[PDB]
Amino acid sequence: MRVLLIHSDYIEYEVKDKALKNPEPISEDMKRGRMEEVLVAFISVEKVDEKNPEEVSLKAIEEISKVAEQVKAENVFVYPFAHLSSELAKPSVAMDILNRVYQGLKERGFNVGKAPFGYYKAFKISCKGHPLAELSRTIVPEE
Amino acid sequence: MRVLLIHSDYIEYEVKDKALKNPEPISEDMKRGRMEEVLVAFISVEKVDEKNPEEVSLKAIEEISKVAEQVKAENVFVYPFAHLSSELAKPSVAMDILNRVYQGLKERGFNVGKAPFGYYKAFKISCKGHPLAELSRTIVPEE
């Protein structure tokens, strides 16, 4: 898994064209979204993650939790961003892992947001530009 | 080298704290910048690139040129983004390569922008969300 963490003043998204034949069904209210004072977690689920979705998910939850706590972000946004990596996991596994990360962070008590799965989406973000506002992490199952 | 290409309506940046002891000296006019209808090239220069800065630079110029042409972007912005990778090249090599990519794209006839080197910078971007608006590329010297 490849994660790009951007501590932002805000993040907005707008669902555009479907990127998969059968994307996540959504309502009008879910086509757009916004969150402020948030640690945006752009995530690309990789092929190697298919070996152990739960393990990789839990590792990601912990890593994202540490960063959020370190930068003082109470809000976290799980953003599907396949193009962060070149070796992607199949769609169902990406969906599974993206959901597990979201559920885990929520269960940990963070205010968490997410965007619909299976779409090309426009987005607007404002990075704080602090020393720790931009971080990358590679999380893979223990081999 | 790791490159994240985001076709955007605009990109703005604001230089914040110095990230290096001796960053690129700049004027007041260079602390901030903006470009519209642009292919933003977030670049992280990697350790392996130190083996052949010119080769990697020329490969990057070609790859970025192809994408810009494919998405119809006449404007390109070379944005230093070290945290895209985990194995970074030393600062002088990153500076060298970031400059070579900028010079090359300019010499190729594109309208090119750049941000000062050696700083933590805040930024605002708006991604178009088209199928090809988000792309990643790994460019390394021929081993």
Ligand SMILES: Nc1ncnc2c1ncn2[C@@H]1O[C@H](CO)[C@@H](NC(=O)[C@@H](N)CO)[C@H]1O
């Ligand atoms: N391995 C993977 N990791 C993360 N997301 C993945 C995925 N495989 C499929 N997706 C989902 O399908 C859309 C097109 O790849 C993805 N959408 C996106 O990556 C948008 N940022 C494009 O604008 C995402 O919803």
Ligand SMILES: Nc1ncnc2c1ncn2[C@@H]1O[C@H](CO)[C@@H](NC(=O)[C@@H](N)CO)[C@H]1O
């Ligand atoms: N290997 C490398 N690749 C790209 N940029 C590099 C680099 N080594 C040093 N820099 C420059 O120094 C700042 C702190 O790493 C870098 N700044 C940044 O990455 C800002 N986006 C932080 O907000 C950049 O100016």
